[model samples]
Target: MVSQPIKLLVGLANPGPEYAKTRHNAGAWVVEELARIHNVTLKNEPKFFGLTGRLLINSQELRVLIPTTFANLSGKAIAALANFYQIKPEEIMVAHDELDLPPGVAKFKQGGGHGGHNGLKDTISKLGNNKEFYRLRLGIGHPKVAGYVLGKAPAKEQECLDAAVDESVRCLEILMKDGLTKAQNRLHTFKAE
Candidate 1:
């Protein structure tokens, strides 16, 4: 049997303690949850320019990477790691925060414009081909005030955010195990039941 190819999952985030628990770092938080669920530990490797880990789902070996570079410079870290592993951009999947979606919701796609996300912008610029990748956008919700999405979640809304994260993680697990089509069918066509 042909072993499943090792897919690269990259989570984009700024590097700093101050950003923890903020909406912008939601992607990294999801990465952490995945590592925890898989019983794997991510190691900071200087040459990789990030923290990296591996997980085996069914027969597939998947590599998970969370760039240590700040959000805007994430491409540097991604390219360095991709080159080191000889992994093509098409094998990559990026998880990042999206201000366009409702809080706690998520969206998945293959490629398009960055939509003003600095991390996505840097990634597309460095890779030089927008067609070669997939993305999972973690919704942070639109900015309540001008020019900022770092707004705090009100206590009453914490449950919604928590539910969204849980849903996203579950959908991701399905994707990893069953491939994109099954995952899309389950997550993309959801309705109140």
Candidate 2:
């Protein structure tokens, strides 16, 4: 299969300052880190319902987005941006927290079910039932505690989350340069240490 380079990099999370440090915001952190690394300016875009920027990285122009929509309704913003830009399914990669995987581990995947992640579910539905998009699953261990996802991660988990986000940023650059298979190989086996 020919892997298309990503043209739109989207991050899924809720809006507001309170959700800023929650484990669920891990995906959003990755996009912010990427913009920081590449000096891309993510600006508030009412039409797109997100903070968005377009810039050249590794000689390829990319559109980065962090949805202002809540996790469950993430599709509204994604569809708006994708439709306006005419970006196809394969060209969009979304980064979001994964509840099933252990912290400190992240994985790259494409064309799959949402695995109960509402953000993914909405993105899938909003994209006209398309499942061909890519996902960067940032692990956030599920604790038995209520509201764990919306709550700030514990000290230890936070450290691991931090590392995973940083690693994702690096892998994304590789994805742009060497392609998806190379990036996926590097990310699938990643560890905090």
Specify the highest-TM-score model's number. Answer: 2
lDDT of 2 at 171: 95
lDDT of 1 by residue, 55-172 (tens): 8776577888889888888887888878877787877889887878777577777878787888898988777755558887777776443235554466555556666667767877
Error of 2 at 172 (Å): 0.3
lDDT tens string, model 2, 50-120? 89998677688889899998889889899999999899977899999998888988998899889888889
Per-residue lDDT for 184 in model 2?
A: 83
The per-candidate count of clashes, in order, stands at 0, 0
Query: In the order shown, what is each candidate's alpha-carbon RMSD?
Result: 2.4, 2.0
Clashing pairs in model 1, backbone N/Cα/C closer than 3 A: none
